[PDB]
Amino acid sequence: AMLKGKYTKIEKVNGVEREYLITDKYGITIGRIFIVDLNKDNRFCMFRMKIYKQGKSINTYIKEILSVFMEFLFKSNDINKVNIIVDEEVSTQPFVELGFAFEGIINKSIIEKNVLKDEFLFGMDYKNYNS
Template sequence: MNDKEMVIIEKVNFKEEYIIKDNIGISLGRFFIIDKSLSNKTCIIRLNFYKEEMESLLLRSLKLILEFFLKSDDVHKLNIIINEDVNPKPFVDLGFTLEGILQNKTTTNTKIKDEFIFGINSYSYINQISKNIFMLKGKRVILKLLTPEDYKDVLDYNIRNKEHLKRFEHLKDQSFYTKEVQKGILIDSYKQYLNGTSLSLGIYNEGSFIGKIQLSNIVQGIFKSAFLGYSIDKEFEGRGFMKESVVKVINYAFRDMELHRIEASTLVDNYRSRAVLKSSGFQEIGLNKDYLYINGQWKDHISFFKINKELY
């Protein structure tokens, strides 16, 4: 390990507060014990990390915190609360699970922000079990659950496809093409995933982010249905990537989620999208007049559906 990446933890007097410092004594952050139950062997801490851009130092700090709490028999389950600006990638890399999101909990420079709750247990820590992000693997694509840490991929995708996607989507102002807005959208979609109402996946080919696919308005109970939506990079159109992605998502929705019906709609003149749906087994319902407000106009759409014939 590089000396510059060395970190230490110091307790602040007799309080349940600890300072994280680098090798020359500069403060990197601090954490507070919010709740600790000896009977349940659980501990909740709030971590404030000041060097948000320094991923390696955050990773090392987390390793020390894990050693501090989970190497003894006193704590079996550790939860760490961070604000939305802290990079979540080191948490995922170390096997943490994002267990919840607290809305509008902190205020920084008059801006109200959300907080993330990450959790890990001693078994996962000791056995170095990594809780991988949800993904579906195909022959040429990998579909990965989009989380707030993916904002760079999504932002770059939207910027380079700004003109391409304009004719398929609602009008967007310039703020849409910023880190803050994209991260906020991903936070909202992750909340919906945790609540079981949406599943937003990034489409990757050979490590490159090439599109998005989503199941939204997921309803269980007597409906067991959802809506399918997707988009793909202009450079990857017409090469079969979207059909493969649609088939993977539909198979998962039917076999694992046990949904009964999936519906999708496409612009009348979007012949490629219509072909994808038909070749994936969708049937045409018919024309929906003035269905969605696209690129400044109400546009007609053709709606499709697919039934899970193996469910009952």
């Protein structure tokens, strides 16, 4: 069971609950999605998207990943509100171009080789998605 876009794939990680692997069509890992909060009564899903540090721009790919996964959450899972936590290093352009709101900045939630880094909090609701 997976999700397919033109250049990307999203698949559940075999051993692990709430973890999904993002790859390209040769099966090289782009990153991973981790479900952080899911509540069916609130129709609410919040996840963390890790993207490997890229040597080049992959904004078209990020846009696809987000588009693929949102379609899944909103249209195949009854979600009303989706939030996405991402390291501030990830390119914020794809999010803004797809219509996500910046809902906050989670300061100093990442420690990476001994420096604390910030995360962005993005949000989108069904109304937003479906307009």
